[PDB]
Amino acid sequence: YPSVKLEFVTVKAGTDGSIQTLIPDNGEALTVSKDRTGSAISPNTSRRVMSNYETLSNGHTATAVIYSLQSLVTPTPKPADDPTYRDGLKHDPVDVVSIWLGRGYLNMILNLKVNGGKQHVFGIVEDLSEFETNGTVNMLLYHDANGDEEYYNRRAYLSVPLDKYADAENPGQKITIKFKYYTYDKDGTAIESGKYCNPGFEYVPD
Ligand SMILES: [Cl-]
Ligand SMILES: [Cl-]
Ligand SMILES: [Cl-]
Ligand SMILES: [Cl-]
């Protein structure tokens, strides 16, 4: 478990790139009264990030004080035939710590065994073969450790966007996300886990 408690949030920058707004997943948008990180994103943009922050209230209105900010991976689900997967599908093992639907994303905290100097590349391999049949979206985690040794535990944060499944001309549509990922079994063998496929994550994009 990490030293600093981190939450999935959205941050917005104003004209100078400084963070002016923090939008918790659980609450309403808050004006950032103080950004102790001194972070700067692209002027007038929003980013889905990890943050340590606190809410301060005067009993009527509250503001956010940011203590830490870090990026998270926002992989767009893509079919196995997409050019990003040209060099083959990679499924280096991970553990799922926590996984849930929230604020238009499929959020997850992963546990990895890393070392250093190698970029861990994440993606979502999309299969829509059952989407017209029963609204099922099949997702397989892509993970390329790039030969990084499995020495130290490290968390990874993913927020899979689900906006592409919303149909404005088909409202009230119930979508079922069935997420698969490779992990180690009790004996240290890498296996494809269907743990989060039964019954899957049901949601109505509205
Ligand atoms: Cl982002
Ligand atoms: Cl106050
Ligand atoms: Cl769990
Ligand atoms: Cl990450």
Task: Explain what you see.
The chain is mostly beta strands and about 210 residues long. It has 2 domains: about 1-70, Beta Barrel (OB fold (Dihydrolipoamide Acetyltransferase, E2P)); about 75-205, Immunoglobulin-like, CATH 2.60.40. The chain has 1 helix and 13 strands; from the N terminus they run βββββββββαββββ. Strands 1-2-3-5-4 form a 5-stranded mixed barrel. Strands 6-9-10-12-13 form a 5-stranded mixed sheet. A 3-stranded antiparallel sheet has the order 7-8-11, with no helix packed on it. Strand 2 (about 20-25) and strand 3 form a beta hairpin. The radius of gyration is 19 Å and the shape is globular. Bound molecules: chloride ion (CL) (4 copies). One chloride ion (CL) binds near residues 56 and 58. The PDB classes it as antitoxin. Keywords: SH3-like barrel fold, Structural Genomics, Joint Center for Structural Genomics, jcsg, Protein Structure Initiative, PSI-biology, antitoxin. It forms a monomeric assembly. Crystal structure of a NigD-like immunity protein (BACCAC_03262) from Bacteroides caccae ATCC 43185 at 2.42 A resolution.
